[PDB]
Paper text:
CSDaV is a positive-sense, single-stranded RNA virus that belongs to the genus Marafivirus in the family Tymoviridae and has a monopartite genome of about 6.8 Kb. In brief, CSDaV encodes for three quasi-equivalent CPs that share amino acid (aa) sequences at the C-terminus but differ from each other at the N-terminus. Each subunit of the asymmetric unit has typical Jelly Roll folds which consist of eight antiparallel beta sheets.
Sodium dodecyl sulfate-polyacrylamide gel electrophoresis (SDS-PAGE) densitometry analysis of purified wild-type (WT)-CSDaV virions showed that > 80% of the CP subunits are composed of the CPp21, while the other < 20% are composed of the CPp23 and CPp25 together, indicating higher expression of CPp21 over the other two CP subunits. The major CP (CPp21) is a product of direct translation from the second start codon in the CSDaV subgenomic RNA (sgRNA), whereas the minor CPs, CPp25 and CPp23, are produced respectively by direct translation from the first start codon in the sgRNA and by proteolytic cleavage processing of the p25 precursor. In attempts to reveal where (if in the inside or outside) GFP is displayed on the GFP-recombinant CSDaV virions (CS-GFPdupCS), we have determined the cryo-EM structures of both the WT- and the CS-GFPdupCS-derived virions. In total, 175,869 and 12,732 particles were used for structure reconstruction of WT and CS-GFPdupCS virions, respectively, yielding density maps at a resolution of 3.1 Å for WT and 3.4 Å for CS-GFPdupCS virus. The primary sequence of the CSDaV major CP (CPp21) was used to generate initial models (by automated homology modeling) for the WT and CS-GFPdupCS virions. Both final models were built as a single asymmetric unit that comprises three chains (A, B, and C). Analysis comparing our results with protein domain structure annotations available in the CATH database, revealed that the CSDaV capsid has similar subunit arrangement and tertiary structure with desmodium yellow mottle tymovirus (DYMV), in which chain A forms pentameric capsomeres while chains B and C form hexametric capsomeres. Residues 1−65 were not visible for the CSDaV WT CPs, while residues 1−276 (including the full aa sequence of the GFP) were not visible for the GFP-fused CP (respectively). However, analysis on the position of each asymmetric unit chain in the capsid of WT-CSDaV particles indicates that the N-terminal region of the CPs is displayed towards the inside of the particle, whereas the C-terminal region is directed to the outside surface of the particle. This might indicate that the N-terminal region, non-visible in the electron density map, could potentially be hidden inside of the particle.
Author numbering:
A (entry chain A), B (entry chain C), C (entry chain A), E (entry chain C), F (entry chain A): 36 to 196
D (entry chain B): 36 to 195
Write the structure that this text describes.
């Protein structure tokens, strides 16, 4: 079946260290990807990764974020991402807002790349992260969580234009 | 180059014989197709056509629409579609409320099917039509215009969504 | 056709964090490259990348710059570069003005390398970046945006010597 | 595709050495040639040249005209046609009042013959000339610049 | 080594018989060719020639120019080009305002075509000419000198622009 | 001809940010390499690079140095190294005096490796750097510029022992 590799990117959420914020999301049910896959019947993840970009305000005040790419069935709790395989702890800020170590790629060999199809899969990739309570300012938004990846979309459906 | 044959269909508008209404539109600049194919680098028509579907109110009051599929460079004036080659004059209504004779398909062998690509072609299809007033009630909506076709889309772009 | 690989480099612009500055530029229409390609009829990008070099004054005050290499048709808005695929957010400064992570290479597989030819292409690479409002000093110019790349130039024209 | 070879010829302009006059024109945008090819989708040159024909009044007063054929991207400045490759400095007048050496043909193998088509080209032929004043008395018209050639027109369009 | 045959043409100057004017120039040090080929590592002439084009004012007042294409080492003095082998003495004007006999081509088999390269050759072509005064009006510009030719340029350098 | 690969290293110069200092040097004419190549007739650069080692005093005060490896013919001016291809801007200091990004290797494919031979080449590598006016102390010497490389030396001459 003919298909196109569709690259996507969006800032998942901007965060400040005012309080701990936990977000766990399944890529099959994400609102901003379902609009991309609404026009196609089949979608398979070629690649995807979670990026934590530091912002300039984080230079003097780092933020620690614990992130993990788990299976759709498993939903890790808040501040428990490092207890699962592949769970990493990213400290953004300090004097070096340069390192690319803040990338967390999804191991699509251990996950089901199919985000859409004839059936709803229970093994789709699900990204869960938790931002810890830092000093906080309530307005700086000195951290950013971003998703980028590629989805192979096939079988366009007769949806709205 | 991998590509998908995207079938599109949408109602251009609904018209009644309250006043004469002219609408000319280049398919490369149509808002609906633009929002469909702004996420892809290349788009090429495989088929496209205009259709004038009669409604129930047209049963007792037929309405006449003059339509033409001209080149991108040529922009027909209002109520002058019959003065261009291929310009048909459909009349929808009466006891015959269903007929395939009101379909006007574009000659993609004569026109240029490419609506998007590396270069800006000047031969894209452009559909022009004029609906003549026959005594509508400003809300009766005697007829409706539907544009349906298929676009082969290749090379998805890293767009906003 | 005989051709020469022409390496080019110029500081695109020096910036201080006094206010947010957004620059989007198409390499086909850039003034400082058109002088290089004025003497040749065909120009094709072998490679090109956008570099954000920190300056010493940025050591105590970092700057965040959001940059993206998009298609010529797409013109991302200010502070929206991270919402497009390949859009990166570079934080220059801090205690480490060393990392080479500030390079943003153009994906010439997803872009048209031809910056000049018989026709004007609508899919040339276009670099769009936005410098955010930092503390600012109005005179330090504590960040630099630089373009370097290689253009294969062929078919010299009878222009001015 | 069916096509017809349209031979065109028109006097670009008559000049006298009253003052220096510069004219640069792209054949895609030439109004006379554009209205010639206004009813066809495609138009491609087969030959074109710029002729500088002396007049009788130029017998005692030659005119110097510097002319060049370039691509549409390159637009020569006034009185600078000899600084571009192929620019030639013609002189019309004197005892020799008729010569084929005053005709400058366009190298359509180097330029792009297509003046009209699906895509607007940036390397279409453009002719730029400059006429240098010698002291003409505002009415002599010692020389005439004439452009003639053949354009093949294909794919008529119903622009009625 | 990839290279391009760059055709160059420019007017050296315009002369009138107001006073005798001498100009000797080595092609490796000519300002116009230097600004052309300062962006390339290697440059080699394929052809080059001097030409004395008569103007309209020369019709009633011919002017004489003595020209020579000597070696880089030899620098002819003023009004002494006829004393060197190959030194021609052209006279432009009169009823014959057009003639190819006033072209002086360089003998690149005798001279050294290389104007730029790894080593500094001492055999580069050098053109010398002297225009004799015949009674010009300080603004009439009886004749003009044009240098035209082709340079094969290889190995572009990372220059300023 | 028999030859030996001779590795060389010397601190080119130690600098403090008291004032801007510009040094451009050709490796064929450098005093400290000519003593190595004085005993041999032919010398060809296998490799060479310019290293900017930060010193401990630079930890609290970084220095920005703009360096470039150009051709022998091209002599870049002060503070204009980033305008040439391969021109880099090195910021030494901060909290991370570790990164090896301060190395600037010479692209010997684009340069003539021969530093000595029967003829004097005009395309030898030439390194030009400029140290900008930092805060300055006049005695710390909180930056170091060092050259290391390898020269293949062949054909020993009857010089002094």
């Amino acid at each position: 079946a003919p298909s196109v590799d569709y690259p996507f990117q969006w800032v998942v959420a901007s965060y400040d260290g005012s309080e701990a914020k936990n977000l766990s999301d399944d890529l099959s049910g994400s609102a901003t990807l379902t609009k991309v896959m609404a026009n196609y019947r089949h979608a398979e993840l070629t690649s995807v990764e979670l990026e934590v970009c530091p912002l300039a305000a984080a230079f003097s005040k780092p933020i620690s974020v614990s992130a993990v790419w788990t299976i759709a069935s498993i939903s890790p709790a808040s501040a428990s991402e490092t207890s699962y395989y592949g769970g990493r702890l990213f400290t953004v800020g300090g004097p070096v807002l340069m390192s690319s170590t803040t990338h967390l790629p999804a191991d699509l060999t251990r996950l089901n790349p199919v985000l859409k199809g004839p059936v709803k899969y229970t093994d789709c990739p699900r990204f869960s992260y938790s931002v810890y309570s830092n000093g906080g300012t309530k307005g700086t938004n000195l951290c950013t969580i971003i998703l980028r990846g590629v989805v192979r979309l096939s079988g366009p459906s007769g949806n709205l234009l």
